[PDB]
Design a protein around this ligand. Structure first.
Ligand SMILES: *[C@@H]1O[C@H](CO)[C@@H](O[C@@H]2O[C@H](CO)[C@@H](O[C@@H]3O[C@H](CO)[C@@H](O)[C@H](O[C@H]4O[C@H](CO)[C@@H](O)[C@H](O)[C@@H]4O)[C@@H]3O)[C@H](O)[C@H]2NC(C)=O)[C@H](O)[C@H]1NC(C)=O
Ligand SMILES: *[C@@H]1O[C@H](CO)[C@@H](O[C@@H]2O[C@H](CO)[C@@H](O[C@@H]3O[C@H](CO[C@H]4O[C@H](CO)[C@@H](O)[C@H](O)[C@@H]4O)[C@@H](O)[C@H](O)[C@@H]3O)[C@H](O)[C@H]2NC(C)=O)[C@H](O)[C@H]1NC(C)=O
Ligand SMILES: *[C@@H]1O[C@H](CO)[C@@H](O[C@@H]2O[C@H](CO)[C@@H](O[C@@H]3O[C@H](CO[C@H]4O[C@H](CO)[C@@H](O)[C@H](O)[C@@H]4O)[C@@H](O)[C@H](O)[C@@H]3O)[C@H](O)[C@H]2NC(C)=O)[C@H](O)[C@H]1NC(C)=O
Ligand SMILES: *[C@@H]1O[C@H](CO)[C@@H](O[C@@H]2O[C@H](CO)[C@@H](O[C@@H]3O[C@H](CO)[C@@H](O)[C@H](O)[C@@H]3O)[C@H](O)[C@H]2NC(C)=O)[C@H](O)[C@H]1NC(C)=O
Ligand SMILES: *[C@@H]1O[C@H](CO)[C@@H](O[C@@H]2O[C@H](CO)[C@@H](O[C@@H]3O[C@H](CO)[C@@H](O)[C@H](O)[C@@H]3O)[C@H](O)[C@H]2NC(C)=O)[C@H](O)[C@H]1NC(C)=O
Ligand SMILES: *[C@@H]1O[C@H](CO)[C@@H](O[C@@H]2O[C@H](CO)[C@@H](O[C@@H]3O[C@H](CO)[C@@H](O)[C@H](O)[C@@H]3O)[C@H](O)[C@H]2NC(C)=O)[C@H](O)[C@H]1NC(C)=O
Ligand SMILES: *[C@@H]1O[C@H](CO)[C@@H](O[C@@H]2O[C@H](CO)[C@@H](O)[C@H](O)[C@H]2NC(C)=O)[C@H](O)[C@H]1NC(C)=O
Ligand SMILES: *[C@@H]1O[C@H](CO)[C@@H](O[C@@H]2O[C@H](CO)[C@@H](O)[C@H](O)[C@H]2NC(C)=O)[C@H](O)[C@H]1NC(C)=O
Ligand SMILES: *[C@@H]1O[C@H](CO)[C@@H](O[C@@H]2O[C@H](CO)[C@@H](O)[C@H](O)[C@H]2NC(C)=O)[C@H](O)[C@H]1NC(C)=O
Ligand SMILES: *[C@@H]1O[C@H](CO)[C@@H](O[C@@H]2O[C@H](CO)[C@@H](O)[C@H](O)[C@H]2NC(C)=O)[C@H](O)[C@H]1NC(C)=O
Ligand SMILES: *[C@@H]1O[C@H](CO)[C@@H](O[C@@H]2O[C@H](CO)[C@@H](O)[C@H](O)[C@H]2NC(C)=O)[C@H](O)[C@H]1NC(C)=O
Ligand SMILES: *[C@@H]1O[C@H](CO)[C@@H](O)[C@H](O)[C@H]1NC(C)=O
Ligand SMILES: *[C@@H]1O[C@H](CO)[C@@H](O)[C@H](O)[C@H]1NC(C)=O
Ligand SMILES: *[C@@H]1O[C@H](CO)[C@@H](O)[C@H](O)[C@H]1NC(C)=O
Ligand SMILES: *[C@@H]1O[C@H](CO)[C@@H](O)[C@H](O)[C@H]1NC(C)=O
Ligand SMILES: *[C@@H]1O[C@H](CO)[C@@H](O)[C@H](O)[C@H]1NC(C)=O
Ligand SMILES: *[C@@H]1O[C@H](CO)[C@@H](O)[C@H](O)[C@H]1NC(C)=O
Ligand SMILES: *[C@@H]1O[C@H](CO)[C@@H](O)[C@H](O)[C@H]1NC(C)=O
Ligand SMILES: *[C@@H]1O[C@H](CO)[C@@H](O)[C@H](O)[C@H]1NC(C)=O
Ligand SMILES: *[C@@H]1O[C@H](CO)[C@@H](O)[C@H](O)[C@H]1NC(C)=O
Ligand SMILES: *[C@@H]1O[C@H](CO)[C@@H](O)[C@H](O)[C@H]1NC(C)=O
Ligand SMILES: *[C@@H]1O[C@H](CO)[C@@H](O)[C@H](O)[C@H]1NC(C)=O
Ligand SMILES: *[C@@H]1O[C@H](CO)[C@@H](O)[C@H](O)[C@H]1NC(C)=O
Ligand SMILES: *[C@@H]1O[C@H](CO)[C@@H](O)[C@H](O)[C@H]1NC(C)=O
Ligand SMILES: *[C@@H]1O[C@H](CO)[C@@H](O)[C@H](O)[C@H]1NC(C)=O
Ligand SMILES: *[C@@H]1O[C@H](CO)[C@@H](O)[C@H](O)[C@H]1NC(C)=O
Lengths: 451, 121, 120, 121, 121, 53, 120
C-alpha cells in the first residue's frame, strides 16, 4: 500500500483576513443628478439580487467586537465628509462682533432666551463698501464678551466651512461587496447573540441594503431583528462595555419643527453666498417629538424580560435618564431634513420593574452649528431650511450602558448613552465577516507521473 | 452549485465542482484600483507556484513525491468520503511550506533527467 | 497598543499651584476626548475635568482649574490651582470611547496608572 | 502582414498568421494606469478561459466535444475558403456563451477519467 | 544559494538552481502602485514570449530550430564549463531579436503540421 | 463709478503668464488590446459604410 | 435620458404676478444654458428670456421679467410681472446646445411639453 501526494487547484477553503471594499449602490437614482455625500456618480453599480446561495454542513464563528469592516467603514465615512466639504465656502469673514437682542413676536412661554436677533456689519460684493445685515441665531451659537455684544461660539477655536446646499445629508443605502478573490459570509441564525459558531452560515458577494445613520442613542432606521428582542454585548459582567439592544417591532417616532423658518441670502464676497435665518412667520413653537405611549411601554417590557436571562429572575430592573455631560450625549442627536436636533429623552427611561392612546411628548433643541464628530477641531454650519421640517423614523434599537453598582442592592439601573459612533454601524454589520479564499490545497492519492 | 456551493460536503465530492471556485477568482476610486491590482497579482502567485511544479494549467496535478503517514496517519478511503476540505486544511495547516519545497526539488530534478534523456539521441 | 503616561504631581502646599499632564501615544489624538478622575480614599471615582470639543468641569471645581489639550504634543494639561486640603486624592487619566465626555466612569475604556497628590 | 493585417481575407488563410494579432495584445496619468490594469486584466481572463479547457497556450486548441449542424448548417469546406472571420463571427454570435459551458464539462469530465486511469496502476 | 546567488559561477552549474532567480520575480503610495503594475506586467511579457514558442511553463524549453556556428563559433563543452552567464550574454547580445523570430516560425509551422496530422484520421 | 462686470457673479483667476494658449497638436492612441480604425473614402459623408477602411 | 418639467402657470389677473420654473434632470446643469419660448395662437415661436452666463430678454419684455438660475436645484425661474393680456400664450422651456443663447428656435435640442398661461 503506497500512495502519493497531489495538489488541487481551486479548492474551497478560507482564512480570516481583511482587505479594502468598494462601492455598491442602486442605479435607480443615478439619473437623479446628486453629487452628495455617499456618492453614486462615482461608484460601481450594484447587482440585482446578488448570488446569495446557501451552504450546508458548515460551521463558522463570528465576532462583532473585533470585526474589521466596522473599523474600515468608519474611515470610509471620515475620509468622505472631509472631501465633500472642500468645495464649500469658509466662514472666516463672518467672525465679527454682533449686536444682539431678544426677539419677542408674541413668543410662547415655553422658550424665552432661545432665538437671538443679531445684526453685524459685513463686506458686500465690492471690497470698499460695507452693509449692515441682520439674522436670527439660536442661543447655543452665541456667547457674551465684556450689555449686548456677542460672537459666534466657535470663532475663537477653529473656523469651519458651510454645508454646501447642493449636497444632502439624508442616508442613502450603501451595499458592501468584496473584491475578486475574496468572499463575504453572512450568519443567519435567529438566536445569534453576536459571538460563537453560526450553524446556517451563507455566502454572498454583496451585503444587503445598509444605511448608516448618524445618531447617538435610539439609533433610527436600523434593520429589525426577526424574533426575540436580543441583547448583544461583549462582556456583560463588565459594566464599561455598551449594550446594543435591538428589538423586532419598531416604534414610530414623529419629530417636527413647527417654526416657519425663511432663508435669506447674504453675499459675503464675489460668488461667496452665505445663508441665514430671516424673519419667523407666525407664532414660535418649540420643536418636539412624539412616540406612542402604549407601544413604548410594551417595547420596554420585552427588553426587560429578555434582560433577566443574564441577571437572574428576582432582580429589580429600573431605567434611569441620561448620565449627564456633553450636550450630544445627554440628549440624542439625529439629523432630519438637513437640520440637526437635540431631543431631551428623560421622559422615556423613567420607570421601575418588579419580578412579580396617549403620546409621550418630549422637548428638543436645535443648533445651526455642530462640532463635527469626524474630528475635534473642524465644526460645520447647517444652513436653515424653509417652511416646516417634519420627518418620521423607525426606532429599532437602543444603546444602554449599565451602572456599576455594588454586588448587593440587586436593583440594577440601566442608563442610555451614545458615545462611540461606531456602535451605530456595528448594529448593522453584525451578520457579515470577510474571508480570504485560498485555493491550491494538498491531498494524498495514487498516481505515477509517466516519464 | 455556486461559488463555494459545496464547501461543507465530502471532499471527494467537492472535487467535482472546482472550476466555479477558480473561474470567479479575478473577475474611493483609488481603493477600487488597489484591490484590482492585488486581486490579479494574487492570482499570478498561485499560477506561478503551480508552474514551477510539474504542471501548468491541468487543474488536477498529481506529483510523484512520496507521501508521509506521519503528516496525516489517516486511511485514504476514510478521508475522501466523509471529511470536508475545511477540516482537512486545519489538520495539515501546521505542515505547510515543507511540501512545497519538496515539490520543487522533485520537479527540477525530474526536468533535468528528461532534458539529458532527449540529448543522448 | 494604547497606553498613557502621567506627570509628577506630588505634595503641594495648601493654596499652592500644580500642573498635571497626560500623553496619549497609541491611538489618534484628534479622535478621542480625555478626562481626569479623582478617587479620594474610601470613596468612589468622580469626574474632575475633561476636554472634548468644549471644556467641562465637575461640581466642586468652581472654576479654579483649567484644562486644555495641545494637539501638537498629543497631550492634555490641567492647570490646577488653589488646592484645598480636601482635594487630596489619586488623579487618574482616562480616554473616552469617542469625542464626547460622560460624567459616568463607565464612559472610558483606557485608564492610567494614577498620580498621587497630597495637600498639607 | 501586420496588426489585423488579414481581417478581410479568407478565414482559412487568416490562420496563416495568428501570433501577430496576439503578440500585440498586452504591450490624466491616472488614465494611463487604469488602461494598463484593464489591458493586463483582459489578457489574464482570456488565458484563464483557455486554461480551464483542455489546453494552456497551444494557440490551436481543438476539442473533442461534438459539433452541431443546427448552429451553422454550412459545409465545412464552403466556409474555410471564401468567408471571412468577421462575417463568421456574426453568424454564430447569437450562439455564444453556450459552447463555452460545453467545453468546460467536456474537459472536467475528461480530467477525472484521466486521473483515475493513472491510479489503477 | 539565494537570489542571483550563483551569477558568477559556471553557466552549466548556474542551471543547478533556476527557480530561485524566477520565483522572486513578482513578489508615494502611487509610485508603489505604478511599480507593482510594471512588475506584474513585465512578467506577463516574459511568459507570453514563451507561450508563442513550443512551451508554456516547462522552464527548460529546448527547440528544434537549427543553431548557427557563426553566432558563437565556440565549442559546446568549452562554454558550458567555464564561461559565466553574464559574460555569455554580451557575446550574443548583438545577435538578439533574430533568434526570437526564428523560434516563432519554427513553432507556428510545427503547430500547423500537427493540426492537419490529427485531422487526416 | 464702475466695477468689473464679473465682481457680482463669481470671482475668477488670472491666466498664468507661464502657460500658453496656442494649439499644440495632440495625437490620440488606443491602449493595449484596442485598435483605432480610420476611414479613407474621399466621398465619405460622415455616416455609412467605408470601403477602404 | 434628458427630460424637463415645468411649473403651473394658470390664469392670472391683468397686471398680476406669476412665476415659472423648469428643472433640468438628465444632463449636467453647469454645462448648458436654458431659455424660454412663447407661441401665441396663430404665430410662430419667439424668444422671451434666457440665462447662460449673462441674462438676455426679448424686445417686448421691456424689463418687466426677471430670469435667474439656481445652481443648487438645477432649475431656471422666470419672475414675470404686470402681464398684459397680449402675453397670453404657451410658454415652452428649452435647453441650448451649449452655454450660449441664440434667439432662433433652432439653437435648442430639448424642448418641453409647454405651460399654458392666460390673462383676462
Ligand atoms: C428614516 O427613514 C425615513 C423614511 O424615508 C426618513 O424620512 C424621510 O425624511 C426626509 C427628510 O428630508 C423626507 O424627504 C423630504 O420629504 C419632504 C416631504 O414634503 C419633501 O418636501 C423634501 O423635498 C425637499 O427637500 C429635499 C432635500 O434634499 C430637496 O432635494 C427637494 O428638492 C425639496 O426641496 C424631502 O424630499 C422623506 O420623504 C422621508 N421619508 C418618507 C416620508 O418616507 C427619515 O429621515 C430617516 N431617518 C433619518 C434620521 O434620516
Ligand atoms: C529658562 O527660563 C525658565 C523660566 O525661569 C526656566 O524654567 C525654570 O525651570 C526650573 C527647573 O526646571 C524651575 O524650578 C522648579 O520650579 C518648580 C515650581 O514650578 C512650578 O510651577 C511651574 C509654573 O508653570 C510649573 O511649570 C512647574 O512644573 C511647577 O509646577 C519647583 O517645584 C521645582 O522644585 C523647581 O525648583 C523654575 O520654576 C522654572 N522657572 C519658572 C519661572 O517657572 C528654565 O530652566 C530656563 N532655562 C534654562 C536652560 O535654565
Ligand atoms: C410660511 O410662510 C410662508 C409665507 O407666508 C407661507 O407661504 C404661503 O404658502 C401658501 C400656499 O403654499 C400661499 O398661498 C398661495 O398663494 C398663491 C399666490 O402666491 C403667488 O405669488 C407667490 C410669490 O412668490 C408665488 O410664490 C406663488 O407661487 C404664487 O405665484 C395663490 O395663487 C394660491 O392659490 C395660494 O393661495 C401663500 O401665498 C404663501 N405666502 C406668501 C407670502 O406668498 C408658508 O405656507 C408658511 N408655512 C406653513 C407651513 O404654513
Ligand atoms: C431685529 O432687530 C432689528 C433692529 O433692532 C429689526 O430691524 C427692523 O425691524 C422693523 C420691525 O421690527 C422692520 O420693519 C420696519 O418697521 C418700521 C415701523 O415704522 C417701518 O417704518 C419700516 O419701514 C420697516 O417696515 C425693519 O424692516 C427692520 N429693518 C430692516 C433693515 O429690515 C429686525 O426686524 C429684528 N428682527 C426681527 C425678526 O424682527
Ligand atoms: C473661547 O471662548 C470661550 C468662551 O469665553 C472660552 O471659554 C470660556 O472661558 C472663560 C475664561 O477663559 C470662562 O470664564 C470662567 O467662567 C467660570 C464659570 O464657568 C467663572 O467662575 C470664572 O471666573 C471665569 O469667568 C468660561 O467659563 C469659559 N466658557 C464659556 C462658555 O464662556 C474658551 O476658553 C475660549 N478658547 C480658548 C482656547 O481659550
Ligand atoms: C450683477 O450686475 C449686473 C449689472 O447691473 C446685473 O444685471 C443688471 O441688473 C439690473 C437690475 O438688477 C438691470 O437693470 C434694469 O435694466 C433694464 C434695461 O435693461 C431697465 O429697463 C430696468 O428698469 C432696470 O434698470 C440691468 O438691465 C441688468 N443688466 C445690466 C447690463 O446692467 C445682474 O443682475 C447682477 N447679478 C445679480 C445676481 O443680481
Ligand atoms: C454568546 O453565545 C456564546 C455561545 O453561543 C457564549 O459563549 C459561551 O458563553 C458561556 C456563558 O454563557 C461561557 O461560559 C463560555 O465560556 C462561552 N464560550 C465561548 C466559546 O464563548 C457567549 O458567552 C455569549 N455571549 C453573551 C454576551 O451572551
Ligand atoms: C405631539 O403630541 C402633542 C400632544 O402632546 C401634540 O400637541 C397638540 O397637537 C394638536 C394638533 O392639532 C394641537 O391641536 C394641540 O394644541 C397641541 N397641544 C396639546 C397640548 O394638545 C403635537 O401636535 C404632536 N406633534 C406631532 C408631530 O405629532
Ligand atoms: C406619526 O405620524 C404618522 C403619520 O403621520 C401616524 O400614523 C397614522 O396614525 C393615524 C392615527 O389615527 C392612523 O389613522 C394612520 O393610519 C397612521 N398612518 C400611518 C402611515 O402610520 C402616527 O400615529 C404618528 N405617531 C403618533 C405617536 O401619533
Ligand atoms: C428633560 O426633561 C425633564 C422633564 O421632562 C427635565 O427634568 C427636570 O429636572 C430638573 C432637575 O432637578 C427638575 O428641577 C425639573 O422639575 C424636571 N422637570 C420637570 C418637568 O419636573 C430635565 O431637566 C430635562 N433635561 C434637561 C437637560 O434639562
Ligand atoms: C418619572 O417617573 C416618576 C415616577 O417614578 C414620576 O413621578 C410623578 O410625576 C408626576 C408629574 O410631576 C407627579 O404628578 C406624581 O406625583 C409623581 N409620582 C409620585 C409618586 O409622586 C415623574 O413625573 C416622571 N418624570 C416625568 C418627567 O414625568
Ligand atoms: C450534509 O451531510 C449529510 C450527511 O453527512 C448529507 O446527507 C448531506 O447531503 C450533506 N449536505 C449536502 C448539501 O449534500
Ligand atoms: C432677554 O432674555 C434673557 C434670557 O435669555 C433675559 O435674562 C433678559 O431679561 C431678556 N431681556 C433683555 C432686555 O435682555
Ligand atoms: C458698523 O460700522 C459702523 C461704523 O461707525 C458702526 O457705527 C456700527 O456700530 C457697526 N455695526 C455694528 C453692529 O457694530
Ligand atoms: C469580564 O470582566 C471581568 C471583570 O473583572 C473579568 O473578570 C472577566 O474575565 C471578563 N470577561 C471577559 C470575557 O472579558
Ligand atoms: C404674533 O406674532 C406673529 C408673528 O408674525 C404675527 O403674525 C401675529 O400678528 C402676532 N399676533 C399678535 C396678537 O401680536
Ligand atoms: C407597562 O405594561 C405593564 C404590563 O405590560 C404594566 O404593568 C405597566 O403598568 C405599564 N406601564 C405603563 C407606564 O403604562
Ligand atoms: C427564570 O425564569 C425562566 C423563565 O421564566 C426559567 O426558565 C428559569 O428556570 C428561571 N430561573 C430561576 C433561577 O428562577
Ligand atoms: C436626569 O434626571 C436628573 C434628576 O434630578 C436631573 O438632575 C438631570 O438633569 C437629568 N438629565 C438630563 C440630561 O436631563
Ligand atoms: C419601519 O418599519 C416598517 C416595518 O418593517 C416598515 O414597513 C417601514 O417602511 C419602516 N420605516 C421606514 C423604512 O422609514
Ligand atoms: C515524514 O515525517 C517525519 C517527521 O515529520 C520525517 O522524519 C520523515 O523524514 C518524513 N518522511 C517523508 C518521506 O516525508
Ligand atoms: C504546530 O506544531 C508545533 C510543533 O509541532 C506546535 O508547537 C504548534 O503549537 C502547532 N500549531 C498548530 C496551530 O497546530
Ligand atoms: C443542437 O442544437 C439543437 C437546437 O439548437 C439542440 O436541440 C441540440 O441538443 C443540439 N445538439 C448538440 C449536440 O449540441
Ligand atoms: C438571437 O436569437 C434569438 C432567438 O433565437 C432572437 O430573438 C434574437 O433576435 C437573435 N439575435 C440576433 C442578434 O441574431
Ligand atoms: C548563419 O549566419 C549567417 C551570417 O550571420 C547567415 O548568412 C546564415 O544564413 C545563418 N544560418 C543559419 C542557419 O542561421
Ligand atoms: C554589433 O554588430 C555590428 C555589426 O555586426 C557593429 O557595428 C556593432 O558595433 C556591434 N555592437 C556591439 C555592441 O557589439
Amino acid at each position: 500500500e503506497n500512495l502519493w501526494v497531489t495538489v488541487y487547484y481551486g479548492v474551497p477553503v478560507w482564512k480570516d483576513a481583511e482587505t479594502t471594499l468598494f462601492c455598491a449602490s442602486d442605479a435607480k437614482a443615478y439619473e437623479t443628478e446628486k453629487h452628495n455625500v455617499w456618492a453614486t456618480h462615482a461608484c460601481v453599480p450594484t447587482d440585482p439580487n446578488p448570488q446569495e446561495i446557501h451552504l450546508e454542513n458548515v460551521t463558522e464563528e463570528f465576532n462583532m467586537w473585533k470585526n474589521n469592516m466596522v473599523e474600515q467603514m468608519h474611515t470610509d465615512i471620515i475620509s468622505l465628509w472631509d472631501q465633500s466639504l472642500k468645495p464649500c465656502v469658509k466662514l472666516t469673514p463672518l467672525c465679527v462682533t454682533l449686536q444682539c437682542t431678544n426677539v419677542t413676536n408674541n413668543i410662547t412661554d415655553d422658550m424665552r432666551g432661545e432665538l437671538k436677533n443679531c445684526s453685524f456689519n459685513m463686506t458686500t460684493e465690492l471690497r470698499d463698501k460695507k452693509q449692515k445685515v441682520y439674522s436670527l441665531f439660536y442661543r447655543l451659537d452665541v456667547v457674551q464678551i465684556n450689555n449686548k455684544e456677542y460672537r459666534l461660539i466657535n470663532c475663537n477655536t477653529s473656523a469651519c466651512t458651510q454645508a454646501c446646499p447642493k449636497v444632502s445629508f439624508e442616508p442613502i443605502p450603501i451595499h458592501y461587496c468584496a473584491p475578486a478573490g475574496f468572499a463575504i459570509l453572512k450568519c443567519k441564525d435567529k438566536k445569534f447573540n453576536g459571538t460563537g459558531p453560526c450553524p446556517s452560515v451563507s455566502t454572498v458577494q454583496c451585503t444587503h441594503g445598509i444605511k448608516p445613520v448618524v445618531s447617538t442613542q435610539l439609533l433610527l432606521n436600523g434593520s429589525l431583528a426577526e424574533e426575540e428582542v436580543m441583547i448583544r454585548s461583549e462582556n456583560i459582567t463588565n459594566n464599561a462595555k455598551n449594550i446594543l439592544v435591538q428589538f423586532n417591532t419598531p416604534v414610530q417616532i414623529n419629530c417636527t419643527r413647527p417654526n416657519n423658518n425663511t432663508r435669506k441670502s447674504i453675499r459675503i464676497g464675489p460668488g461667496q453666498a452665505f445663508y441665514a435665518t430671516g424673519d419667523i412667520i407666525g407664532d414660535i413653537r418649540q420643536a418636539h417629538c412624539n412616540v406612542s405611549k402604549a407601544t413604548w411601554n410594551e417595547t420596554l417590557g420585552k427588553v426587560v424580560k429578555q434582560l433577566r436571562k443574564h441577571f437572574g429572575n428576582n432582580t429589580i430592573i429600573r431605567f434611569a435618564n441620561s448620565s449627564g455631560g456633553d450636550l450630544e450625549v445627554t440628549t440624542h442627536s439625529f439629523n432630519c431634513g438637513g437640520e440637526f436636533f437635540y431631543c431631551n429623552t428623560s421622559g422615556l427611561f423613567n420607570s421601575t420593574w418588579i419580578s412579580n392612546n396617549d403620546s409621550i411628548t418630549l422637548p428638543c433643541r436645535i443648533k445651526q452649528i455642530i462640532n463635527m464628530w469626524q474630528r475635534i477641531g473642524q465644526c460645520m454650519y447647517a444652513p436653515p431650511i424653509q417652511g416646516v421640517i417634519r420627518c418620521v423614523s423607525n426606532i429599532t434599537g437602543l444603546i444602554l450602558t449599565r451602572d456599576g453598582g455594588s454586588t448587593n442592592s440587586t436593583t440594577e439601573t440601566f442608563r442610555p448613552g451614545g458615545g462611540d459612533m461606531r456602535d451605530n454601524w456595528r448594529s448593522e454589520l453584525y451578520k457579515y465577516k470577510v474571508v480570504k479564499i485560498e485555493p491550491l490545497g494538498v491531498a494524498p492519492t495514487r498516481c505515477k507521473r509517466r516519464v | 452549485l455556486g461559488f463555494l456551493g459545496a464547501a461543507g460536503s465530502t471532499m471527494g465530492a467537492a472535487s467535482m465542482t472546482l472550476t466555479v471556485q477558480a473561474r470567479n477568482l479575478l473577475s474611493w476610486g483609488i481603493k477600487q484600483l488597489q484591490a484590482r491590482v492585488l486581486a490579479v497579482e494574487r492570482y499570478l502567485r498561485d499560477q506561478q507556484l503551480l508552474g514551477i511544479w510539474g504542471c501548468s494549467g491541468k487543474l488536477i496535478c498529481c506529483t510523484n513525491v512520496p507521501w508521509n503517514s506521519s503528516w496525516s496517519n489517516r486511511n485514504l478511503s476514510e478521508i475522501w468520503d466523509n471529511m470536508t476540505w475545511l477540516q482537512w486544511d486545519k489538520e495539515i495547516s501546521n505542515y505547510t511550506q515543507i511540501i512545497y519545497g519538496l515539490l520543487e526539488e522533485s520537479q527540477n530534478q525530474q526536468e533535468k533527467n528528461e532534458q539529458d534523456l532527449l540529448a543522448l539521441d | 497598543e494604547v497606553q498613557l503616561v502621567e506627570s509628577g504631581g506630588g505634595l503641594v502646599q495648601a493654596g499652592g499651584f500644580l500642573r498635571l499632564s497626560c500623553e496619549l501615544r497609541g491611538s489618534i489624538f484628534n479622535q478621542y476626548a480625555m478626562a481626569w478622575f479623582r478617587q479620594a480614599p474610601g470613596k468612589e471615582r468622580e469626574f474632575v475635568a475633561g476636554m472634548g470639543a468644549v471644556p467641562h468641569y465637575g461640581e466642586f471645581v468652581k472654576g479654579r482649574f483649567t484644562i486644555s489639550r495641545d494637539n501638537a504634543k498629543s497631550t492634555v494639561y490641567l492647570q490646577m490651582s488653589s488646592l484645598k486640603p480636601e482635594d487630596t486624592a489619586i488623579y487618574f487619566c482616562a480616554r473616552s470611547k469617542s469625542t464626547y465626555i460622560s460624567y459616568n466612569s463607565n464612559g472610558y475604556d483606557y485608564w492610567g496608572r494614577g498620580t498621587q497628590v497630597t495637600v498639607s
